[PDB]
Design an enzyme around this catalytic site. Structure first.
Site, short mmCIF file in Angstrom:
data_model
loop_
_atom_site.label_atom_id
_atom_site.label_comp_id
_atom_site.label_asym_id
_atom_site.label_seq_id
_atom_site.Cartn_x
_atom_site.Cartn_y
_atom_site.Cartn_z
N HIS A 1 0.81 -1.22 0.00
CA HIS A 1 0.00 0.00 0.00
C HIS A 1 0.85 1.27 0.00
CE1 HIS A 1 -1.87 -3.35 2.23
NE2 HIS A 1 -2.89 -3.14 1.42
S1 FES Z 1 1.99 -0.40 3.10
FE1 FES Z 1 0.39 -1.84 3.63
S2 FES Z 1 1.49 -3.66 4.28
FE2 FES Z 1 3.06 -2.16 3.87
#
Ligand code: FES
Length: 141
Positions: A106
């Site tokens: 993410h």
């Molecule tokens: S940014 Fe979501 S698991 Fe690393």
């Protein structure tokens, strides 16, 4: 006992060794002079997470670069390779926008001391119980 003993005698500057401990990766990066200087150039006020997240020192310690490495010289950065958002493995080799690690799940960016700087992760990558027991070996746990 749970503790393991990692031979780091062949880890050169700019190399990360990844070892599995308690079922998860631990990153052992021998930091370059650029990595060290850049980590030491960040003011606490610029950090998302000002807590060191370091099992070896006081739980209220500040996330200064010095409180993120095992050694005073700052060469040895040892941390859980577990993104503090949802647990993906951050990608190293000086990745992301802050010269550290990038978690592609993410989009979390960690700096050269493993501190969270951008994205959804709330915390700096945590540092396990870890210490040198001689010149060449780091005990984990
Ligand atoms: S940014 Fe979501 S698991 Fe690393």
């Amino acid at each position: 006992l749970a503790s393991i003993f990692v031979d780091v005698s062949s880890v050169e500057p700019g190399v990360q060794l990844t070892v599995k401990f308690l079922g998860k990766p631990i990153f052992i990066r021998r930091r370059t002079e650029a990595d060290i200087e850049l980590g030491r150039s960040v003011q606490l006020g610029q950090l998302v997470d000002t807590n060191a997240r370091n099992a070896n020192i006081d739980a209220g310690a500040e996330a200064t670069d010095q409180n993120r490495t095992l050694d005073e010289a700052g060469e040895w950065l040892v941390m859980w390779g577990v993104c503090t958002h949802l647990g993906c493995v951050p990608i190293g080799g000086v990745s992301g926008d802050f010269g550290g690690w990038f978690c592609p799940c993410h989009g979390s960016h960690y700096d050269s001391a493993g501190r969270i700087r951008k994205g959804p992760a709330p915390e700096n990558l945590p540092i396990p119980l870890a210490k040198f027991i001689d010149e060449t070996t780091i005990q984990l746990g």
